Design a protein around this ligand. Sequence first.
Ligand SMILES: O=C(O)CNC(=O)C(=O)O
Ligand SMILES: [Mg+2]
Ligand code: NI
Ligand SMILES: [Zn+2]
Length: 331
Amino acid sequence: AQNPNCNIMIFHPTKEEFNDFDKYIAYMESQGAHRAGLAKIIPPKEWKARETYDNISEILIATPLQQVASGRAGVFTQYHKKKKAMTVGEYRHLANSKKYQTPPHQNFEDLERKYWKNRIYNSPIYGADISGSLFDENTKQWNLGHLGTIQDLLEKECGVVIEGVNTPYLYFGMWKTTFAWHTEDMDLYSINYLHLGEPKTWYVVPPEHGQRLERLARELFPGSSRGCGAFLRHKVALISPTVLKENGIPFNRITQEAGEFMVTFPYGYHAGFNHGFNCAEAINFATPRWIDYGKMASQCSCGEARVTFSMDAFVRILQPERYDLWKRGQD
Ligand SMILES: O=C(O)CNC(=O)C(=O)O
Ligand SMILES: [Mg+2]
Ligand code: NI
Ligand SMILES: [Zn+2]
């Protein structure tokens, strides 16, 4: 069995290997990359996502989210307070202000220590989940706006034609902006490209150990667990590496820098934080190996998780027994 310790693997495809996206994902899996839940892909030196980032300041962040924490430094939830719209140029200036800028630090490990010590005492503002793309239309390799759609994959594997679309999302971050512990909708893959700016630190639990993280989460967030049998679908809970180590939960960590891709694998729980002003683009995708994970994915039916239009068909076809309850949660 390849990668039996579930380490995060890093790949350096050649320009030739970068042509066929599906083939390269299958290659990485042949080497055991999925066992970690997360992989890094460094593009060949010849490749670029677009020519420059000099003309992005007029993109609108219609609903910036202030991420307000509650709890203790290693075990907290966050809620998202909506703020007034602002442009990317306005947001960049805010991220670089004395109130929000990255503190002086020695290295990534020092900054990680400062994040876990101090995150809860601040409320950073995240421009998340913005439909759009920064890939040039002429970029033919690993262009996250030109991937095969999940609807087409389900149709190819299972024969059923379904409604829905699959487009990318932009994330504009600042110091301390945080992504809570989650797997993807319907335990899909994700791919994330860091277009510009400061790094993003990731934490990940191997898919084969995901239920250990869920059991810890029910212990640490006991009111939330009574409210919903899949409350990590709410995407609000944080648990630090120190707390994970104290409770024996298997995990790994890695820092993504600008110009790098990360892939999350089905049922790979992940969480993380941004080091400073940055912009990422991410999208969900599927492969044949996903189908079995989609059929077994948990679902939030309490009303909190509220998701895209396109998840309807995935539930309806892969999980017909759960469909009626889940749809009630959507309405
Ligand atoms: O970058 C972020 O804030 C969160 N991204 C992801 O969870 C991802 O790409 O799957
Ligand atoms: Mg612009
Ligand atoms: Ni994710
Ligand atoms: Zn719920």
